[PDB]
């Protein structure tokens, strides 16, 4: 079996990106955030506390006639942004794109924090991490796609982020025309639950490409890049004005400014990504100082390649028996 499924920017900036899955029988329909720094599937439902619901649509399992609570499971989870939702658990039928899964596990948000609530566009999110990293308890769950994985014709995923445009996600196939070039495949640690990796260098602008290993995780649920305060360092330095700003909480620019590209290495194949990319606009209505999409994962403990720079590349999320990421440009 295969699923195709388009994935859509929630706001002009790319933020996140929702992609609609059916829940249930009938079918319910949520947009989700497929989030491959995690691995637990939720949602907005009907149980969720009332106050903390603001315009998203919600999964009623009692109007599922698939729907079967999962006695005695919890979950609960927080996220590197701060966020959080908790709850309990039903099985009930999953389909993406036109592959089903029959008894997945999909929790059900009692309780969701701010800025779930503040987010009318995101209905819950879908994990893609490694099910090491789900959160139920006692029993833990498997994800959508380790549910899939023995009936997929092949034991992969892919990531096609666009920029300020949709894009897709398909589950069991490579799309030999959605890329240029060649995927270059890479080595990935499933030791922390992550799509972890080491990339090979990068380059700022038109500058020499550098090469040094920085180890890091393919997160589609992450925004923007994080990588070590040096490589950041050097990015921003060749932007007029830029300046990172405690008060604002990172790296600043001037929105005059035209934003050099950012290069990475994948062994020796290199994604770039356009100055455009890394522009995230005004920090508030009206400022003319703008956000920059590269920041530092200092104290984060972690490298995050995030949405700026995952939509760069065509990316191949390679569940075999040994994983591996493969990256192409687009």
Same mark, same amino acid.
């Given at each position: 079996?295969?699923?195709?499924?388009?994935?859509?920017?929630?706001?002009?900036?790319?933020?996140?990106?929702?992609?609609?899955?059916?829940?249930?029988?009938?079918?319910?329909?949520?947009?989700?955030?497929?989030?491959?720094? $995690?691995?637990?599937?939720?949602?907005?439902?009907?149980?969720?506390?009332?106050?903390?619901?603001?315009?998203?649509?919600?999964?009623?399992?009692?109007?599922?006639?698939?729907?079967?609570?999962?006695?005695?499971?919890?979950?609960?989870?927080?996220?590197?942004?701060?966020?959080?939702?908790?709850?309990?658990?039903?099985?009930?039928?999953?389909?993406?794109?036109?592959?089903?899964?029959?008894?997945?596990?999909?929790?059900?948000?009692?309780?969701?924090?701010?800025?779930?609530?503040?987010?009318?566009?995101?209905?819950?999110?879908?994990?893609?991490?490694?099910?090491?990293?789900?959160?139920?308890?006692?029993?833990?769950?498997?994800?959508?796609?380790?549910?899939?994985?023995?009936?997929?014709?092949?034991?992969?995923?892919?990531?096609?982020?666009?920029?300020?445009?949709?894009?897709?996600?398909?589950?069991?196939?490579?799309?030999?025309?959605?890329?240029?070039?060649?995927?270059?495949?890479?080595?990935?640690?499933?030791?922390?639950?992550?799509?972890?990796?080491?990339?090979?260098?990068?380059?700022?602008?038109?500058?020499?490409?550098?090469?040094?290993?920085?180890?890091?995780?393919?997160?589609?649920?992450?925004?923007?890049?994080?990588?070590?305060?040096?490589?950041? $360092?050097?990015?921003?330095?060749?932007?007029?004005?830029?300046?990172?700003?405690?008060?604002?909480?990172?790296?600043?620019?001037?929105?005059?400014?035209?934003?050099?590209?950012?290069?990475?290495?994948?062994?020796?194949?290199?994604?770039?990504?356009?100055?455009?990319?890394?522009?995230?606009?005004?920090? $508030?209505?009206?400022?003319?100082?703008?956000?920059?999409?590269?920041?530092?994962?200092?104290?984060?403990?972690?490298?995050?390649?995030?949405?700026?720079?995952?939509?760069?590349?065509?990316?191949?999320?390679?569940?075999?028996?040994?994983?591996?990421?493969?990256?192409?440009?687009?």
């Amino acid at each position: 079996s295969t699923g195709s499924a388009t994935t859509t920017p929630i706001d002009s900036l790319d933020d996140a990106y929702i992609t609609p899955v059916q829940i249930g029988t009938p079918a319910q329909t949520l947009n989700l955030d497929f989030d491959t720094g $995690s691995s637990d599937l939720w949602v907005f439902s009907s149980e969720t506390t009332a106050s903390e619901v603001d315009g998203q649509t919600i999964y009623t399992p009692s109007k599922s006639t698939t729907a079967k609570l999962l006695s005695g499971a919890t979950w609960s989870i927080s996220y590197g942004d701060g966020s959080s939702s908790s709850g309990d658990v039903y099985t009930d039928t999953v389909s993406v794109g036109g592959l089903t899964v029959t008894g997945q596990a999909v929790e059900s948000a009692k309780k969701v924090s701010s800025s779930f609530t503040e987010d009318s566009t995101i209905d819950g999110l879908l994990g893609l991490a490694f099910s090491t990293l789900n959160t139920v308890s006692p029993t833990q769950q498997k994800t959508f796609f380790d549910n899939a994985k023995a009936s997929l014709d092949s034991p992969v995923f892919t990531a096609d982020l666009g920029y300020h445009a949709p894009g897709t996600y398909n589950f069991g196939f490579i799309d030999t025309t959605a890329y240029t070039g060649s995927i270059t495949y890479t080595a990935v640690s499933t030791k922390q639950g992550f799509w972890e990796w080491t990339s090979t260098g990068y380059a700022v602008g038109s500058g020499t490409f550098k090469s040094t290993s920085i180890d890091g995780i393919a997160d589609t649920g992450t925004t923007l890049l994080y990588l070590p305060a040096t490589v950041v $360092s050097a990015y921003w330095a060749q932007v007029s004005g830029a300046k990172s700003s405690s008060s604002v909480g990172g790296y600043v620019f001037p929105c005059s400014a035209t934003l050099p590209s950012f290069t990475f290495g994948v062994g020796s194949a290199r994604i770039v990504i356009p100055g455009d990319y890394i522009d995230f606009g005004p920090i $508030s209505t009206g400022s003319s100082s703008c956000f920059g999409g590269i920041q530092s994962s200092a104290g984060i403990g972690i490298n995050i390649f995030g949405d700026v720079a995952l939509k760069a590349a065509f990316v191949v999320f390679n569940g075999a028996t040994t994983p591996t990421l493969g990256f192409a440009s687009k």
